[model samples]
Target chain A: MQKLRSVKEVPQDLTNTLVNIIELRADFELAMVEQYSPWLVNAPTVDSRLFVAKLVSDELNHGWQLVRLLEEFKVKDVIERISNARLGIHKLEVSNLPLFNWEDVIAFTFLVDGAGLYQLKILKDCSFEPLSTLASSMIKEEESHIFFSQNELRNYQNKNRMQGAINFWFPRAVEMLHMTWSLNETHLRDLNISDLTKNDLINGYIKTTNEELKKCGYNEVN
Target chain B: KLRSVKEVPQDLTNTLVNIIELRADFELAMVEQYSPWLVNAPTVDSRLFVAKLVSDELNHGWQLVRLLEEFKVKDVIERISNARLGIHKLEVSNLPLFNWEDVIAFTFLVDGAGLYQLKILKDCSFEPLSTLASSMIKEEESHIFFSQNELRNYQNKNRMQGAINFWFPRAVEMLHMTWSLNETHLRDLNISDLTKNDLINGYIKTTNEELKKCGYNEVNY
Candidate 1:
């Protein structure tokens, strides 16, 4: 299918679609900023600590890229300010909660970020060509995030810490990925946008995560 | 200086009840909000810093609870299901934290205010509390410094004006809730008469100073 030459060709609710993508992507990044910053001087090692700092800047840039797209597209009713009362219904449900421990940190990175990567992957061929290109670039950054998360997990995998972290976060990861949105997979599918079904996304996430867990000498999370 | 809870006047004992409840409620909130960051911080040093902060909060809560125990106050740490939630505990204290900025701003305001209250407690009717107050002062001071430095860093670089602006009113709201104790109530309870307004101004007074110390242009806070 050819990329729609302009956003003007955007079908009904496609604006909503792009807006949700931009808003969710950006809000999700901001949530990471909140959860990650405390670790700036608190990670296990200077190496991992420095990596987190670099990774945080990259994530902000990723969000910035999406925000610019929203401005370029003239998306309104957007998140222009920060207030507990105003910022309602986070795109990722887990983003609205705390990532409380080292186990939680990596579990979130390994699992939730993995789900985020799938989202960008699905958006790669979205009818909006600009979004598609942005998605194309974002996927690389997400890959590194997953890579970093997995490596962190591996380091902590065998210790007494792994079981507690995995148990607490695995269910959350699964639940967070399958959120029932105002816009769902079927809406995108009917719009000839997203190629995958909801089940396809959910089952794949479980499988991908379990495979990694098994490789790490942990039991299947699901 | 009272020797024991038995010799303390009933009204004064009731006031200690009031004071310990507020202190326990506030410290519990601190523990809940800061504990999550113990594992999620961006650097090893920050993670350990938060861990220690959480430990301090827990210790503070324990001290307050033991004081409450002496006064026969049950459910000091229990979740609110019965009709017993203290009116003085800030809703923010019970509220689950969603962002790190919320945590920092909270510490910036709450810990600073906490120091002032600790000062008031130093010469109270009860001797143990005065002792507890003195013990808490140093750690509380350190926590405030840690919070302030982090807040300054955020406000200094990348200009965390979004977080600052967002949380300013909430901080105001929290101090309002925390310091709801009025002059008459303090007199009735026979405690230090640092009224609600006094408590709030005391908080803002210190916080605004930190804003200036961090190199912000605004001086008249």
Candidate 2:
């Protein structure tokens, strides 16, 4: 393990860069929580409420974990930080609705949350101690969330819930890799992150994400 | 003083080895049977509990494998094969149900019983096994506390009479099953000086009495 000296060892210019990543993570979670809370209340069956509640809780917990990590970086308030960054992924548009059709929820979890998992796993071995510790628990919990999303996707497919699954999840899963599409060599070396370009991240994400999708019977990843 | 491998009793040692294999078998059976339902459990909290339970079972299986290697066991594959067959027969013959209430009962009563056994093993003569037990017990304690809340909530809600009726008998039968196993394997193995009859009677009797105080009658097995 590389010994971490202090937060100062982290590059200065990367402050907002790191903040942007955290903003994306926290914003997605907050969007999901706002989107799902009312849906859970209006859900017709107890089973629906149960599933939605679980998904909501998972996102809420993830948001909480990210906020704690941001605090360690001396970025005190997640909401305030996200307000400053003003980065918008179109996924946040879904926050306006009370009931997201099951497809929307599945897509959000499988694509958006799935993307977060990839980023967090790399952060697990981060040079920062507090971030790394948070990453450990986050990774374990995220694995469960990922599996839950995958299973739900399968259930939807089995029940012929196709268009919703694809429309919501598939495109977003593709777009998630776009972050690396614009990265330069300096950015990669400075960030100390692997896979310099966005295309590279997309290709890698596609390979694994498609493999998972295929196992759940969504053979279109090719 | 460290005892050489050659100095250990073959028959007694084999029993100790077999127990580790049994524990692994128990853990894997739990994962295989529960993971699917966990993924589909009614509430988010319940689903999370199932996920945690499956993870804990995998960790327990890892610990069991480590113990088997420390004891110089050469045939883990062969042991696992027999253990799987035994578990399959037990599950089929017993035909355990996988409803929500049944899951709660399994965690609350069956795993509660397991917590007691693991607590005892935490003080075992084997250093590695004892250390693993110490850490594993903390996880088990969380499971037990959560299950207790589930059981209390179920009764308080006054729902699922069928579940309560079903689990009451099953819990009693679980005690009977352990009693038979303890008498044969635990006693012959010489793992502990504690009498099998006393171990079973003391734990089950106290647990059953406690359940009665909680307004559940001790269902006759």
| Residues forming the 10-long window of minimal summed lDDT in candidate 2 chain B | B84-93
Q: After superposition, which runs of candidate 1 have C-alpha atoms over 4 Å from their true positions?
A: A81-89, A180-187, A190-192, B1-221
Error of 2 at A8 (Å): 34
Q: Flag clash pairs in model 2.
A: A54-B44, A180-A197, A180-A198, A181-A198
All models, RMSD in angstroms: 14.2, 13.0
Q: In TM-score terms, which candidate is top?
A: 2
List each candidate's DockQ score.
0.02, 0.02
The sequence of per-residue lDDT tens digits that candidate 2 reaches over residues B1-221 is 11333444565566556556655666655655554444346554665576567657765765577567656676863455344324442342234446777776677666676676677666655556556767888888888787666766674334444555566555445444443344444544334533355656666677667656555555444
Tens digit of per-residue lDDT, candidate 2, span A1-222: 453445666667656665555565666665565566543434444355455656666665666566555665677565454433222432344333333576666666676677767777766655555555666677777677677667777777444565455555666556655654554446444555554244656677778877877788776544
Compute the lDDT for candidate 2: 0.58
Q: Which regions in candidate 2 have their CA more than 4 angstroms from the true location?
A: A1-222, B1-7, B70-86, B89-97, B155-161, B164-195
